[PDB]
Amino acid sequence: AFRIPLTRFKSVRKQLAEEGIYIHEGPYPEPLVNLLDVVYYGPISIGTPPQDFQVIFDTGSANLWLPSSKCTTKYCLHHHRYDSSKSSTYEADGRNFTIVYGSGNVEGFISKDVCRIGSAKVSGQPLGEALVVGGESLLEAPFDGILGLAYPSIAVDGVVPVFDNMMKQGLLGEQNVFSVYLNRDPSSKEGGEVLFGGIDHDHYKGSITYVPVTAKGYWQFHVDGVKSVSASKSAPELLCKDGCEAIANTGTSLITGPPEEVDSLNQYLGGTKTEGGQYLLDCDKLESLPNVTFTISGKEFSLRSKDYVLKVNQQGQTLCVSGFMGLEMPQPLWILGDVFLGPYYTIFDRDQDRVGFAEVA
Ligand SMILES: [N+]
User: List the disulfide bonds (predicted).
Assistant: First the structure.
């Protein structure tokens, strides 16, 4: 058991929306990392002596990458960079890599070195030395790179994900799991935490409801249904009626699903489609907005409007936005961002290949 503290920051997509600037997505070939949407980072260090970094701990991807000292692009010059020549434990690989991101590609070459995750010491860990990171308005971003916590099958050639090497090296004891506490509250000192090799009882109430992983790549599982139900409507909103597939993604905020289904959901909520793509709700009519519920392994996971409405500062206008939007992919998926993962503590279990949810504390 070792514990990494997470810090929450306002996403670049949000900073853009405040100045009244929107960028359309997509459609996507499948779920992609998008650096405009990432909201939680935590510290790691690489090499000997340690070189310090802030990275996104991302269940939506499986790669570890950081800006290379050899990268002199704008993004890299504005962040911490890994210098292999300064580390006595560096071990060369040298092969090239490319990753398709929603925010523009990430490219470079593979290297190996000690990766430090709090008190844990991951040895011979492959990483991407990034020479290219796309694109606009990431010069402020408080994170340097990404550390992926998904399965090895969606890693680039030459990388084994960080958690997998923690497993091979016996660093987690008997529980090959990691647990994630996300605090969406702006005020609090702790933004959240990732607990490696354990489950923290202090962070949830009730019991944990497990769901089996369906396709090993993303942390992907089956959802029984999605619905919203209200005393103020002649009909319910019933979606995902015959079951659907979802992924848990700590690398994003909004809940994303098949467009026609979430458009319908947003209409039911009284939403108004912005030219930006998000749906506006009346800020004075948030009180009687119905819960939206996800049924997983026969159990209901309810979201209150307090959980799913996002507030944004436009100019002077405070302005309220639905935390659900459509994103088409060929193999339709609900992507569960922090809107879902904030009010639910989440256990990621590689022993049994399952994901656990319990009410947060
Ligand atoms: N990107």
Answer: 71-76, 240-244, 283-320
Q: Do domains 34-172 and 173-361 have the same CATH topology?
A: yes
Q: Cα separation of 58 and 148, whole Å?
A: 5
Distance CA 158, CA 231 (A): 55
35 CA from centroid of ligand 1 (Å):
5
Taking the CB of residue 119, how many other CB atoms lie within 10 A of it? Answer: 11
The reply to whether ligand 1 has any atom less than 6 angstroms from the CB of 106 is yes
Note whether 57 and 250 are within 8 A (CB): yes
- The verdict on the CB of residue 107 being under 6 Å from ligand 1 is no
Ligand 1 center from residue 229 Cα (angstroms): 38
CATH 3.30.830.10 fits 34-172, yes or no: no
Specify the CATH number of the domain 173-361: 2.40.70.10
H or E segment to which residue 207 belongs:
strand 204-216
User: Ligand 1 pocket, 104 CB below 6 A?
Assistant: yes
> Which pair of structure tokens corresponds to residue 170?
């016996």
Resolution, given in Å to one decimal, reads 2.3
Domain boundary assignment for the chain? 34-172, 173-361
Structure-block tokens of residue 216: 């090993």
Cβ of 38 closer than 6 Å to ligand 1, yes or no, is no
DSSP reduced 3-state for 109: strand
| Chain breaks after residues in the chain, where C lies over 2.5 Å from next N | none
Q: Is 63 in the pocket of ligand 1 (CB under 6 A)?
A: no
Q: Is 61 in the pocket of ligand 1 (CB under 6 A)?
A: no
Q: Which method resolved this structure?
A: X-ray
